[PDB]
Enzyme design. Structure first.
Site, PDB file in Angstrom:
ATOM      1  N   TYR A 286      -4.499 -10.808   9.449  1.00 57.63           N
ATOM      2  CA  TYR A 286      -5.519 -10.478   8.456  1.00 57.63           C
ATOM      3  C   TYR A 286      -6.863 -11.105   8.828  1.00 57.63           C
ATOM      4  CZ  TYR A 286      -1.668  -9.070   5.339  1.00 57.63           C
ATOM      5  OH  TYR A 286      -0.557  -8.464   4.785  1.00 57.63           O
TER       6      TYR A 286
ATOM      7  N   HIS B 266      -6.152   0.456   2.505  1.00 60.49           N
ATOM      8  CA  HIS B 266      -5.023   0.882   3.330  1.00 60.49           C
ATOM      9  C   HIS B 266      -4.827   2.399   3.295  1.00 60.49           C
ATOM     10  CE1 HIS B 266      -3.239  -2.518   5.209  1.00 60.49           C
ATOM     11  NE2 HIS B 266      -2.948  -3.162   4.094  1.00 60.49           N
TER      12      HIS B 266
ATOM     13  N   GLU C   8       0.806  -1.219   0.000  1.00 63.72           N
ATOM     14  CA  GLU C   8       0.000   0.000   0.000  1.00 63.72           C
ATOM     15  C   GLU C   8       0.848   1.282   0.000  1.00 63.72           C
ATOM     16  OE1 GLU C   8       0.217  -2.293   2.381  1.00 63.72           O
ATOM     17  OE2 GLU C   8       0.142  -1.458   4.407  1.00 63.72           O
TER      18      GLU C   8
ATOM     19  N   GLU D 129      -4.322  -4.648   9.310  1.00 66.98           N
ATOM     20  CA  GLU D 129      -4.783  -5.661   8.368  1.00 66.98           C
ATOM     21  C   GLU D 129      -6.234  -6.074   8.586  1.00 66.98           C
ATOM     22  OE1 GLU D 129      -3.256  -6.087   5.856  1.00 66.98           O
ATOM     23  OE2 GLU D 129      -1.359  -5.183   6.478  1.00 66.98           O
TER      24      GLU D 129
ATOM     25  N   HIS E 169      -8.144  -4.159  -1.472  1.00 69.37           N
ATOM     26  CA  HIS E 169      -7.394  -4.252  -0.225  1.00 69.37           C
ATOM     27  C   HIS E 169      -6.346  -3.134  -0.110  1.00 69.37           C
ATOM     28  CE1 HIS E 169      -5.584  -6.523   3.191  1.00 69.37           C
ATOM     29  NE2 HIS E 169      -4.502  -5.891   2.775  1.00 69.37           N
ATOM     30  N   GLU E 170      -5.542  -2.952  -1.154  1.00 70.18           N
ATOM     31  CA  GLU E 170      -4.517  -1.909  -1.160  1.00 70.18           C
ATOM     32  C   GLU E 170      -5.122  -0.501  -1.128  1.00 70.18           C
ATOM     33  OE1 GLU E 170      -1.873  -3.051  -0.435  1.00 70.18           O
ATOM     34  OE2 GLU E 170      -2.006  -5.121  -1.138  1.00 70.18           O
TER      35      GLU E 170
ATOM     36  N   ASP F  78       9.633 -10.711   9.294  1.00 70.82           N
ATOM     37  CA  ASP F  78       9.420 -11.487   8.074  1.00 70.82           C
ATOM     38  C   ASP F  78       9.199 -12.971   8.340  1.00 70.82           C
ATOM     39  OD1 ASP F  78       9.681  -9.230   6.442  1.00 70.82           O
ATOM     40  OD2 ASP F  78      11.857  -9.510   6.251  1.00 70.82           O
TER      41      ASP F  78
HETATM   42  N1  4BQ Z   1       1.241  -4.730   3.644  1.00 73.20           N
HETATM   43  C1  4BQ Z   1       1.062  -5.522   2.413  1.00 73.20           C
HETATM   44  C2  4BQ Z   1       1.807  -6.870   2.506  1.00 73.20           C
HETATM   45  C3  4BQ Z   1       3.255  -6.730   3.000  1.00 73.20           C
HETATM   46  C4  4BQ Z   1       3.346  -6.781   4.530  1.00 73.20           C
HETATM   47  O1  4BQ Z   1       2.355  -6.544   5.229  1.00 73.20           O
HETATM   48  N2  4BQ Z   1       4.542  -7.201   4.992  1.00 73.20           N
HETATM   49  C5  4BQ Z   1       4.892  -7.321   6.300  1.00 73.20           C
HETATM   50  C6  4BQ Z   1       6.122  -7.933   6.594  1.00 73.20           C
HETATM   51  C7  4BQ Z   1       6.482  -8.212   7.924  1.00 73.20           C
HETATM   52  C8  4BQ Z   1       5.624  -7.881   8.984  1.00 73.20           C
HETATM   53  O2  4BQ Z   1       6.026  -8.193  10.276  1.00 73.20           O
HETATM   54  C9  4BQ Z   1       5.092  -7.820  11.335  1.00 73.20           C
HETATM   55  C10 4BQ Z   1       4.195  -8.749  11.883  1.00 73.20           C
HETATM   56  C11 4BQ Z   1       3.323  -8.344  12.907  1.00 73.20           C
HETATM   57  C12 4BQ Z   1       2.402  -9.254  13.453  1.00 73.20           C
HETATM   58  C13 4BQ Z   1       2.352 -10.574  12.976  1.00 73.20           C
HETATM   59  C14 4BQ Z   1       3.223 -10.985  11.954  1.00 73.20           C
HETATM   60  C15 4BQ Z   1       4.146 -10.076  11.408  1.00 73.20           C
HETATM   61  C16 4BQ Z   1       4.386  -7.253   8.697  1.00 73.20           C
HETATM   62  C17 4BQ Z   1       4.025  -6.978   7.364  1.00 73.20           C
HETATM   63  C18 4BQ Z   1      -0.424  -5.811   2.230  1.00 73.20           C
HETATM   64  O3  4BQ Z   1      -1.049  -6.178   3.243  1.00 73.20           O
HETATM   65  O4  4BQ Z   1      -0.898  -5.678   1.085  1.00 73.20           O
HETATM   66 ZN    ZN Z   2      -2.838  -5.282   4.015  1.00 71.51          ZN
END
Ligand code: 4BQ
Ligand code: ZN
Ligand code: YB
Ligand code: YB
Ligand code: YB
Length: 607
Positions: A381, A297, A269, A316, A293-294, A373
């Site tokens: 979500y 955001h 986003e 999310e 979705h995007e 990551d």
């Molecule tokens: N934000 C984009 C996808 C990319 C994205 O959200 N990446 C991302 C990468 C790592 C992240 O780490 C944080 C986290 C926080 C809670 C649970 C799991 C992970 C959180 C988000 C979308 O939703 O279209």
């Molecule tokens: Zn998202």
């Protein structure tokens, strides 16, 4: 709360209000070089030194007020990177601000960037670069307070080879020949809305555009332009629905960038310029929920932002909720309920995969000493969406809850917030229903691992035919196989085909003969829709069909959306017949893969 994922000075000490970025893009050396002028504001008296985040950055000098100043890089702490402490020449008091200009160079191994050779692009003549900072990779492009608890405006000038185009998460502010010599072109950008630094994005390549809406251009290489412009035509009408749900769209332009197949997510986003995977190009617009979705955001996430990554579900859950209302307005409330129920199914999968006592199946998480990551999944979500859908039904329906959501957005715009801010605003908005609110098991929903304590109610209209067909296949015996026919699919949308496969996959393996007959009657091999092909090939592999091995290896390597690529490699590794080739294929590809994806599949494959 402190941000355990950042090493920088917390927002309770100082805050970056603005970034000025001038840099040049060097493909020959795979570096971004330039200066990052940070306008920093003190939150306390007698501030003399602050600490910023960096990762694999080369720091040439730190200038303040025309002079060079002292700075020290601490030892790197794994995925967090190395803290950069900067000494201020004058001691700041509350609300006083200095401008610190840092000359930096990025490593070619920047985890925020993928550098593609020309052979890796559609055109084969020019190289390509793109960034992906979320969650904590911005620090691998430039020194910053790499935490969502800080929001800044920014302006950018970037010098690139004149044959190439640069785009950022900002308003395009014109382009001129680079005065400082080369046949390079310099591109300008301005972002007047304060944003968390994870929303800073850059792309450089042989880009063409096409206008598909009054505030929307589609960008990609020439060979994808026409297809993209068609696929995402509905974009403006979704923006209007979104504005009706969330309030005014404040960002000005909503452009789309269709990246190389290696882009790791379905979309990102980035303000003013959403990024999307080319795997959305199904040719029938059927994957447009990712665009919705995007778009959503643009309010939940970019305007109201999680203050730390522990509260990621706020970004999310609310966006999935809005996403599904957009698609429900467009195609009906029955479709909204179908997508809602499918989402619960994805949650079941995530919880089974992690295990029901796994910390990553909690809604609010603790990322202390966890690489973001690695924690990432569909849990925030879909558990987040499920909570909001349950509250929608508990508090009197979508009309009522959408009123809350708009007031929520208005209340916290331009701010970064925690789960608690959200919840006691919920209680304040619904003061007349606090007794209802006190009925929900907050501890379980927010803090307990596993499936939610209660399941919402879902309309079953569009789901019923999926359940009937999957059950017929799951329970089929030899004397049923000849009755299956292409006519089974007659009145099923692509969305239902996908859901049929998802339900069937939950009960894999099926007998090998069944899966052979399935290809025989339905010809799923011929479908290019990425969501469907993904699940079909997973079903084939887990059911031990050797003929599906080259198909799966091909999809896993020809694109790099982690949603598809990671589980394909993982299924292939678990299949004894494909294991060795799966590992060999990864080893041969990892050098050309996105850095985060390469890392995650390597962990997955345990090599
Ligand atoms: N934000 C984009 C996808 C990319 C994205 O959200 N990446 C991302 C990468 C790592 C992240 O780490 C944080 C986290 C926080 C809670 C649970 C799991 C992970 C959180 C988000 C979308 O939703 O279209
Ligand atoms: Zn998202
Ligand atoms: Yb150097
Ligand atoms: Yb250098
Ligand atoms: Yb039978």
């Amino acid at each position: 709360i402190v941000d355990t994922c950042s090493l920088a000075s917390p927002a309770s000490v100082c805050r970056t209000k603005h970034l000025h970025l001038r840099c040049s893009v060097d493909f020959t050396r795979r570096t971004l070089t330039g200066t990052a002028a940070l306008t920093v504001q003190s939150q306390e008296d007698n501030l003399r030194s602050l600490v910023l985040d960096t990762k694999d950055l080369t720091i040439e000098k730190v200038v303040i007020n025309g002079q060079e100043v002292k700075y020290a890089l601490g030892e790197r702490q794994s995925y967090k990177g190395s803290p950069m402490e900067i000494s201020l020449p004058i001691a700041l008091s509350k609300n006083q601000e200095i401008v610190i200009e840092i000359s930096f160079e990025t490593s070619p191994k920047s985890s925020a960037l993928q550098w593609l050779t020309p052979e890796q692009t559609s055109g084969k003549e020019h190289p390509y670069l793109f960034s992906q900072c979320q969650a904590i990779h911005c620090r691998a492009i430039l020194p910053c307070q790499d935490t969502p608890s800080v929001k800044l405006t920014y302006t950018a000038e970037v010098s690139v080879p004149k044959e190439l185009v640069a785009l950022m998460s900002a308003i395009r502010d014109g382009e001129t020949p680079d005065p400082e010599d080369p046949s390079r072109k310099i591109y300008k950008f301005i972002q007047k809305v304060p944003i968390p630094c994870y929303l800073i994005a850059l792309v450089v390549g042989a880009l063409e555009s096409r206008q598909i809406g009054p505030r929307t251009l589609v960008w990609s290489e020439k060979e994808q332009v026409e297809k993209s412009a068609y696929e995402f035509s509905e974009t403006e009408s979704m923006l209007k629905i979104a504005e009706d749900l969330g309030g005014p769209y404040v960002w000005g332009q909503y452009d789309l960038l269709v990246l190389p197949p290696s882009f790791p997510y379905g979309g990102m986003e980035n303000p003013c310029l959403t990024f999307v995977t080319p795997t959305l190009l199904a040719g029938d617009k059927s994957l447009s929920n990712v665009i919705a979705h995007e778009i959503s955001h643009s309010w939940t996430g970019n305007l109201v932002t999680n203050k730390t990554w522990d509260h990621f579900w706020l970004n999310e859950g609310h966006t999935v909720y809005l996403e599904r209302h957009i698609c429900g307005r467009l195609f009906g409330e029955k479709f909204r309920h179908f997508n809602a129920l499918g989402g619960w199914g994805e949650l079941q999968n995530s919880v089974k995969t992690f295990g029901e006592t796994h910390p990553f199946t909690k809604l609010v998480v603790d990322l202390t000493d966890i690489d973001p990551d690695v924690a990432y999944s569909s849990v925030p979500y879909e558990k987040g969406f499920a909570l909001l859908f349950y509250l929608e039904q508990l508090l009197g329906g979508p009309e009522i809850f959408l009123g809350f959501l708009k007031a929520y957005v208005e209340k916290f715009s331009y701010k970064s917030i925690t789960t608690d801010d959200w919840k006691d605003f919920l209680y304040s908005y619904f003061k007349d229903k606090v007794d209802v609110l006190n009925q929900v098991d907050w501890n379980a929903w927010l803090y307990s691992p596993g499936l939610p304590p209660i399941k919402p109610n879902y309309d079953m209209t569009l789901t019923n035919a999926c359940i009937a067909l999957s059950q017929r296949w799951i329970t089929a015996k030899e004397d049923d196989l000849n009755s299956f026919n292409a006519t089974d699919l007659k009145d099923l949308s692509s969305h239902q085909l996908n859901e049929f496969l998802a339900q069937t996959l939950q009960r894999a393996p099926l007998p090998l003969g069944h899966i052979k007959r399935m290809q025989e009657v339905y010809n799923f091999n011929a479908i290019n829709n990425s969501e469907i092909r993904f699940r079909w090939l997973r079903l084939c592999i887990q059911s031990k069909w050797e003929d599906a091995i080259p198909l799966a290896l091909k999809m896993a390597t020809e694109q790099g959306r982690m949603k598809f690529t990671r589980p394909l490699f993982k299924d292939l590794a678990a299949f004894d017949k494909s294991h060795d080739q799966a590992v060999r294929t990864y080893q041969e590809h990892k050098a050309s893969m996105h850095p985060v994806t390469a890392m995650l599949v390597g962990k997955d494959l345990k090599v």
